[PDB]
Amino acid sequence: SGEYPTVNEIPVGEVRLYQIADGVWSHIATQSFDGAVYPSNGLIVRDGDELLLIDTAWGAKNTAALLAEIEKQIGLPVTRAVSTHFHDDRVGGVDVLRAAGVATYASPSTRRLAEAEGNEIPTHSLEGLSSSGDAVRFGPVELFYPGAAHSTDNLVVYVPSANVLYGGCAVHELSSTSAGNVADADLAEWPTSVERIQKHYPEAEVVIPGHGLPGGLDLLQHTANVVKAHKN
């Protein structure tokens, strides 16, 4: 009823939306993985009379529920989606999106890694993001490649109209005391990549992690702190 939703308000298979700013929402869903349940976030950004989606809802059925929740709560069509890295919490549901008429995008690096892993594969390649510090415009957002962090391909997303920074899984929530799922991470490079984010988006007012509660710019330093402690 107004607070940012958590697993306890989200059974696996339901999706909730949360208004971040004018024309900016996060989507929250839950999924089971290796016998434990986790929340995950994505983003929705108004693009005139259309919507841009950032990341799936972690699974085909969750992503179908996401589209249904968007129709219920917003009522504008999702025309494009960007996946910010290759794991299932970002691309699982791309097939559902593609069958719903959504054009799906990711960097070539994400597409290659998704294909190699057996995950669903966005249709279109996002060029211009292969070097750390690269940025490109995509509808109402800027996509930024900070360097290797949670994964080698992770992208972050900035909504300049609202100073909203969606860090994806390269950014952790303030309550975290570990670095999450680090199987594909570069713990040595991650702090440098976070520093690049901090330098590029110093005016960010809301920072949204890939999992957990949004906050302010402090999430960036906190992430560097937990990653460094994990590496150690």
Ligand X SMILES: C[C@@H](c1cccc2c(-c3ccc(CS(C)(=O)=O)c(F)c3)c(C(=O)O)[nH]c12)n1cc(CNS(=O)(=O)CCN)nn1
Question: HSE of 98 in the Cβ direction (CA atoms, 13 Å)?
Answer: 13
By CB under 6 A, tell whether 186 contacts ligand X.
no
Q: Please confirm, yes or no, whether 85 is among the known catalytic residues.
A: yes
Tokens of 164: 């909203």
Using N-to-C axis directions, what is the helix angle for 190-200 and 218-231, rounded to 10°?
A: 170
14: left (phi over 0), alpha (psi -120 to 50) or beta: beta
Q: Does the annotation flag 85 for ligand binding?
A: yes
Q: Residues 47, 55, 62, 87: which is the catalytic one?
A: 87
By CB under 5 A, tell whether 87 contacts Zn ion.
yes
Q: Please confirm, yes or no, whether 150 is among the known catalytic residues.
A: yes
Interface positions, 100-159, toward ligand X (CB under 6 A): 150
Partners of 21 in the β-ladder: 24
Residue 126 CB, nearest distance to ligand X (Å)?
A: 20
By CB under 6 A, tell whether 214 contacts ligand X.
no
Nearest to 150, CA basis, from 197, 116, 199, 183: 183
Partners of 19 in the β-ladder: 25
Instruction: Write the CB contacts of 41 (distance below 8 Å, at least 6 apart in sequence).
Output: 26, 27, 28, 55, 208, 209, 210, 211, 212, 214
Residue 28 CB, nearest distance to Zn ion (Å)?
A: 13
By CB under 6 A, tell whether 1 contacts ligand X.
no
Total residues found in the chain within this entry: 232
Q: Please confirm, yes or no, whether 27 is among the known catalytic residues.
A: no
Partners of 38 in the β-ladder: 31
Tokens of 230: 């994990």
Interface positions, 28-87, toward ligand X (CB under 6 A): 33, 38, 87
Partner touching 116 among ligand X, Zn ion, none, CB below 5 to 8 Å by kind: none
Residue 181 CB, nearest distance to ligand X (Å)?
A: 4
Sign of CA pseudo-dihedral 208, 55, 63, 102: positive
Q: Does the annotation flag 211 for ligand binding?
A: yes
Member of 73, 132, 163, 181 binding ligand X (CB under 6 A): 181
By CB under 6 A, tell whether 14 contacts ligand X.
no
By CB under 6 A, tell whether 172 contacts ligand X.
yes
Contact residues for ligand X, defined by CB under 6 A: 33, 38, 87-89, 150, 169, 172, 176-178, 180-181, 183-184, 210-211
Contact residues for Zn ion, defined by CB under 5 A: 87, 89, 169, 210
Q: Which sequence positions are flagged as catalytic?
A: 85, 87, 89, 150, 181
